[PDB]
Amino acid sequence: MLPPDILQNGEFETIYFQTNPTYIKSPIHIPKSTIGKPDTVKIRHFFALLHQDLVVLGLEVFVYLQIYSDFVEKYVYVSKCDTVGLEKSTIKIGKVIGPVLQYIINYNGYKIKMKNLDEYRTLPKTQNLRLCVFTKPAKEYLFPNSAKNPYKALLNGQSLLRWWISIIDSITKGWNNHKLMIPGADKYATRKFIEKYSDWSEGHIFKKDGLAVQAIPLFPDDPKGRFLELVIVECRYGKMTVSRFYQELAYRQEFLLGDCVSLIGCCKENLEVTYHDDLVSTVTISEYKEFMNLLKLVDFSDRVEVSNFVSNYRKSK
């Protein structure tokens, strides 16, 4: 998952676990009319890098498997990425985040139970990959109270976007498309971010026509998803088209008052995958939520609190 130059013989340690794969309702609304409906399986991934007894950084990624008869629509959604900054950086963050995210994208060792027909399922070998990332500069995505730490780098929106583009480009070499949208920015403004990236273009990866709710996935804690929720609760889901959704997304407070809030999607079509067991720690969703709730109670400006959080986790293993 990580190269030896980084871990350095136990100088650095990793936390990494997945939830047990869990059937959910599709994040993209499928009409009951639509027959051939996929089963949806979600897996949460949490990764953190440790330096000695302190947390360095963390990454949360959700994977959604739209399982059809002969293929899988696989969506990889970056939920949160954050740093602590209690100690001087000795590693370029991207050179951890990149490889971890690539590992998660390519992971295909899920132990998926059979769907209750009203001992593990075998997935189709054909997979179409979708990578979905939003960029929004927020001081503390994962590590409360860390924005005050001496060595925490706080990128503005434009810098954060450039950073994400460079990471994503490096782990999506050869993919079918790489799309960037900056809602409310004009075509020339968006295109300077990708002028040096020959494989990138303006727009989004989802179905272009029809109702937005039948095209755009609703991901948790996603600025895009927050507007999709409003369209659904206000029962405008029947009328709102994809194009009108993205037009109106530009005027939401989160975008129009935000700092270069951006939406990235990349696709790779018709990939032949071989399912390979890769033994990693798996947890129930309650265990996962328990860990995340402990995390949001830690003062990450306090080495004492961070070090106990880590030792307590080392005890849990």
Swiss-Prot record:
<protein>
    <recommendedName>
        <fullName>Histone acetyltransferase RTT109</fullName>
        <ecNumber>2.3.1.48</ecNumber>
    </recommendedName>
</protein>
<dbReference type="GO" id="GO:0030447">
    <property type="term" value="P:filamentous growth"/>
</dbReference>
<comment type="function">
    <text>Histone chaperone-dependent acetylase that modifies 'Lys-56' of histone H3 (H3K56ac), to promote genomic stability, DNA repair and transcriptional regulation during mitotic S-phase. Plays an important role in the regulation of white-opaque genotoxin induced-switching.</text>
</comment>
<keyword id="KW-0804">Transcription</keyword>
<dbReference type="InterPro" id="IPR016849">
    <property type="entry name" value="Rtt109"/>
</dbReference>
<keyword id="KW-0007">Acetylation</keyword>
<dbReference type="GO" id="GO:1900239">
    <property type="term" value="P:regulation of phenotypic switching"/>
</dbReference>
<keyword id="KW-0227">DNA damage</keyword>
<dbReference type="InterPro" id="IPR013178">
    <property type="entry name" value="Histone_AcTrfase_Rtt109/CBP"/>
</dbReference>
<dbReference type="GO" id="GO:0036166">
    <property type="term" value="P:phenotypic switching"/>
</dbReference>
<keyword id="KW-0808">Transferase</keyword>
<dbReference type="Pfam" id="PF08214">
    <property type="entry name" value="HAT_KAT11"/>
</dbReference>
<dbReference type="GO" id="GO:0032931">
    <property type="term" value="F:histone H3K56 acetyltransferase activity"/>
</dbReference>
<dbReference type="GO" id="GO:0010484">
    <property type="term" value="F:histone H3 acetyltransferase activity"/>
</dbReference>
<comment type="similarity">
    <text>Belongs to the RTT109 family.</text>
</comment>
<keyword id="KW-0805">Transcription regulation</keyword>
<feature type="binding site">
    <location>
        <begin position="153"/>
        <end position="155"/>
    </location>
    <ligand>
        <name>acetyl-CoA</name>
    </ligand>
</feature>
<feature type="domain" description="Rtt109-type HAT">
    <location>
        <begin position="1"/>
        <end position="317"/>
    </location>
</feature>
<feature type="active site" description="Proton donor/acceptor">
    <location>
        <position position="222"/>
    </location>
</feature>
<dbReference type="InterPro" id="IPR051236">
    <property type="entry name" value="HAT_RTT109-like"/>
</dbReference>
<keyword id="KW-0539">Nucleus</keyword>
<dbReference type="GO" id="GO:1900429">
    <property type="term" value="P:negative regulation of filamentous growth of a population of unicellular organisms"/>
</dbReference>
<dbReference type="GO" id="GO:0006974">
    <property type="term" value="P:DNA damage response"/>
</dbReference>
<dbReference type="GO" id="GO:0044182">
    <property type="term" value="P:filamentous growth of a population of unicellular organisms"/>
</dbReference>
<feature type="binding site">
    <location>
        <position position="134"/>
    </location>
    <ligand>
        <name>acetyl-CoA</name>
    </ligand>
</feature>
<keyword id="KW-0843">Virulence</keyword>
<dbReference type="GO" id="GO:0006355">
    <property type="term" value="P:regulation of DNA-templated transcription"/>
</dbReference>
<feature type="binding site">
    <location>
        <position position="163"/>
    </location>
    <ligand>
        <name>acetyl-CoA</name>
    </ligand>
</feature>
<feature type="binding site">
    <location>
        <position position="138"/>
    </location>
    <ligand>
        <name>acetyl-CoA</name>
    </ligand>
</feature>
<feature type="modified residue" description="N6-acetyllysine; by autocatalysis">
    <location>
        <position position="224"/>
    </location>
</feature>
<dbReference type="GO" id="GO:0005634">
    <property type="term" value="C:nucleus"/>
</dbReference>
